Design an enzyme around this catalytic site. Structure first.
Site, PDB file in Angstrom:
ATOM      1  N   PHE A  80       0.832  -1.199   0.000  1.00 44.22           N
ATOM      2  CA  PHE A  80       0.000   0.000   0.000  1.00 44.22           C
ATOM      3  C   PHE A  80       0.871   1.255   0.000  1.00 44.22           C
ATOM      4  O   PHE A  80       0.609   2.200  -0.745  1.00 44.22           O
ATOM      5  CB  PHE A  80      -0.932  -0.021   1.215  1.00 44.22           C
ATOM      6  CG  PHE A  80      -2.227   0.735   1.024  1.00 44.22           C
ATOM      7  CD1 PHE A  80      -3.381   0.318   1.671  1.00 44.22           C
ATOM      8  CD2 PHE A  80      -2.292   1.859   0.215  1.00 44.22           C
ATOM      9  CE1 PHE A  80      -4.575   1.001   1.510  1.00 44.22           C
ATOM     10  CE2 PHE A  80      -3.483   2.548   0.049  1.00 44.22           C
ATOM     11  CZ  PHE A  80      -4.625   2.118   0.698  1.00 44.22           C
ATOM     12  N   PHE A  81       1.910   1.253   0.831  1.00 38.31           N
ATOM     13  CA  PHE A  81       2.861   2.359   0.864  1.00 38.31           C
ATOM     14  C   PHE A  81       3.540   2.543  -0.491  1.00 38.31           C
ATOM     15  O   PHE A  81       3.677   3.664  -0.979  1.00 38.31           O
ATOM     16  CB  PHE A  81       3.919   2.133   1.946  1.00 38.31           C
ATOM     17  CG  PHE A  81       3.481   2.541   3.327  1.00 38.31           C
ATOM     18  CD1 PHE A  81       3.138   1.588   4.272  1.00 38.31           C
ATOM     19  CD2 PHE A  81       3.422   3.880   3.681  1.00 38.31           C
ATOM     20  CE1 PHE A  81       2.743   1.962   5.546  1.00 38.31           C
ATOM     21  CE2 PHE A  81       3.025   4.262   4.954  1.00 38.31           C
ATOM     22  CZ  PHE A  81       2.688   3.300   5.888  1.00 38.31           C
ATOM     23  N   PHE A 183      -7.248   7.127   2.864  1.00 39.49           N
ATOM     24  CA  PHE A 183      -6.543   6.514   3.987  1.00 39.49           C
ATOM     25  C   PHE A 183      -7.015   5.077   4.178  1.00 39.49           C
ATOM     26  O   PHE A 183      -6.411   4.309   4.929  1.00 39.49           O
ATOM     27  CB  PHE A 183      -6.751   7.319   5.274  1.00 39.49           C
ATOM     28  CG  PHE A 183      -5.826   6.921   6.395  1.00 39.49           C
ATOM     29  CD1 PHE A 183      -4.525   7.394   6.436  1.00 39.49           C
ATOM     30  CD2 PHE A 183      -6.259   6.074   7.404  1.00 39.49           C
ATOM     31  CE1 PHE A 183      -3.671   7.031   7.464  1.00 39.49           C
ATOM     32  CE2 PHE A 183      -5.409   5.705   8.434  1.00 39.49           C
ATOM     33  CZ  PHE A 183      -4.113   6.184   8.463  1.00 39.49           C
ATOM     34  N   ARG A 323      10.049   7.382   6.482  1.00 41.96           N
ATOM     35  CA  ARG A 323       9.183   7.832   5.400  1.00 41.96           C
ATOM     36  C   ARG A 323       8.923   9.335   5.456  1.00 41.96           C
ATOM     37  O   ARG A 323       8.790   9.989   4.421  1.00 41.96           O
ATOM     38  CB  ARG A 323       7.856   7.065   5.423  1.00 41.96           C
ATOM     39  CG  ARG A 323       6.880   7.477   4.331  1.00 41.96           C
ATOM     40  CD  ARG A 323       5.650   6.585   4.303  1.00 41.96           C
ATOM     41  NE  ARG A 323       4.684   7.027   3.301  1.00 41.96           N
ATOM     42  CZ  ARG A 323       4.738   6.698   2.013  1.00 41.96           C
ATOM     43  NH1 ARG A 323       5.714   5.922   1.563  1.00 41.96           N
ATOM     44  NH2 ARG A 323       3.815   7.148   1.175  1.00 41.96           N
TER      45      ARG A 323
HETATM   46  C1  LIG Z   1       0.037   5.336   2.196  1.00 45.66           C
HETATM   47  C2  LIG Z   1      -0.474   5.526   3.608  1.00 45.66           C
HETATM   48  N1  LIG Z   1      -1.244   4.359   4.078  1.00 45.66           N
HETATM   49  C3  LIG Z   1      -0.300   3.256   4.318  1.00 45.66           C
HETATM   50  C4  LIG Z   1      -0.935   1.892   4.151  1.00 45.66           C
HETATM   51  C5  LIG Z   1      -2.233   3.975   3.055  1.00 45.66           C
HETATM   52  C6  LIG Z   1      -3.383   4.961   3.000  1.00 45.66           C
HETATM   53  C7  LIG Z   1      -1.948   4.684   5.341  1.00 45.66           C
HETATM   54  C8  LIG Z   1      -1.088   4.751   6.594  1.00 45.66           C
HETATM   55  C9  LIG Z   1      -0.297   5.863   6.874  1.00 45.66           C
HETATM   56  C10 LIG Z   1       0.476   5.912   8.028  1.00 45.66           C
HETATM   57  C11 LIG Z   1       0.450   4.852   8.927  1.00 45.66           C
HETATM   58  C12 LIG Z   1      -0.345   3.742   8.663  1.00 45.66           C
HETATM   59  C13 LIG Z   1      -1.118   3.698   7.509  1.00 45.66           C
HETATM   60 MG   LIG Z   2       1.240   9.967   0.316  1.00 47.16          MG
END
Ligand SMILES: CC[N+](CC)(CC)Cc1ccccc1
Ligand SMILES: [Mg+2]
Ligand SMILES: [Mg+2]
Ligand SMILES: [Mg+2]
EC number: 4.2.3.37
Length: 340
Positions: A80-81, A183, A323
């Site tokens: 996802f990242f 998110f 990050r």
């Molecule tokens: C890309 C950001 N994220 C990661 C999976 C997807 C929407 C949410 C997220 C951000 C920060 C911490 C945990 C999840």
């Molecule tokens: Mg982003």
């Protein structure tokens, strides 16, 4: 030491961190998975993967999850990242064609992951692998819910694409609606269920206390990300952030916007604390003395427990993960862990 503008004393004092015992093995397995699926180059995995703390944040969230479940969640989350990075690069380099195709491929793979386990786009193949494994824990009705939710997430990412291309900064509440999708609020909420080994009936998971607790957990996580990733996102011409929408449409300064986001974040905590009591009381009510009742009670209790864990895990993740360490980059507009 957390920066004063990002510090939340209530989290630090009233939300003690928890860590899944499978984490050490988790950190290594996801790293190997990233390598073997070729989602990141070898030298960048070697240098950045561990420091990104992607496994850490999930291991501090879904406590009680079977090792296999947590592993699939971690791999998916790391993907996802990387997808977020790919999405970002497509926008920056104006690759509208590449994004549209990826967008369509993800929609397709989401419904039939097994067919895409070895797709030429490694990002698609990586996606398919994690999703197929996620589909093997609970009945197909849960899988369908996950798919329905993520179909919406993909389209939200597409709207982000068009926003940043056209240079449009969304309105505050327009963003607030969108943010629940970008998110992936409801994906993480869904994933609570295989973590506690039980697909909750609609009557249970749509209980107002469960719904509200689940929502607040995600709103905190998303908005706190906005707060902490703001300097990274400003430097990278990202326009999707609660602070940015406040600066653009409410004439707030950077200092005023940060303060307003903080208060909204803090308010999430205390609102959660109130509804958490109702949610936990609901868990007690489910335990009516029956086998099914005890099962549902334990699952809800675990899930609500993890809704709470999300607060502390996300909080510390943003201070530990490389990050968001924009200050340490030679080029603030281009994070070193991203394929440019
Ligand atoms: C890309 C950001 N994220 C990661 C999976 C997807 C929407 C949410 C997220 C951000 C920060 C911490 C945990 C999840
Ligand atoms: Mg982003
Ligand atoms: Mg994003
Ligand atoms: Mg962010």
């Amino acid at each position: 030491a957390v920066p004063p503008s990002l510090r939340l004393p209530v989290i630090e004092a009233a939300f003690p961190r928890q860590l899944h015992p499978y984490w050490p093995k988790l950190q290594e397995t996801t790293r190997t998975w990233l390598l073997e699926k070729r989602l990141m180059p070898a030298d960048k995995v070697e240098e950045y993967a561990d420091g990104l703390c992607y496994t850490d944040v999930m291991a501090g969230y879904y406590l009680g999850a079977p090792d296999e479940v947590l592993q699939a969640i971690a791999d998916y989350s790391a993907w996802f990242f990387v997808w977020d990075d790919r999405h970002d690069r497509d926008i920056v380099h104006g690759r509208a064609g590449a994004w549209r195709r990826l967008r369509g491929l993800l929609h397709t793979a989401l419904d039939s992951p097994g067919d895409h386990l070895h797709h030429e786009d490694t990002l698609v193949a990586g996606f398919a692998d994690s999703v197929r494994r996620l589909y093997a824990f609970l009945p197909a009705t849960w899988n369908a819910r996950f798919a329905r939710h993520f179909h919406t997430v993909i389209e939200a990412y597409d709207r982000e694409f068009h926003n940043r291309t056209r240079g449009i900064v969304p309105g505050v509440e327009e963003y607030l609606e969108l943010r629940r999708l970008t998110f992936a609020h409801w994906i993480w909420t869904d994933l609570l269920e295989p973590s506690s080994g039980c697909e909750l009936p609609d009557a249970v998971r749509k209980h107002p206390a469960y719904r509200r607790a689940a929502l607040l957990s995600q709103e905190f996580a998303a908005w706190y990300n906005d707060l902490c990733s703001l300097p990274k996102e400003i430097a990278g011409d990202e326009v999707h952030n609660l602070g940015i929408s406040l600066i653009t449409h409410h004439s707030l300064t950077l200092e005023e916007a940060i303060g307003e986001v903080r208060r909204r974040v803090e308010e999430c905590i205390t609102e959660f604390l109130a509804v958490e009591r109702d949610a936990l009381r609901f868990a007690d009510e489910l335990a009516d003395g029956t086998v099914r009742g005890k099962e549902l009670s334990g699952a809800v209790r675990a899930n609500v427990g993890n809704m709470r864990n999300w607060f502390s895990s996300v909080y510390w993740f943003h201070h530990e993960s490389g990050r968001y360490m924009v200050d340490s980059w030679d080029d603030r507009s281009t994070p070193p862990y991203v394929n440019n």
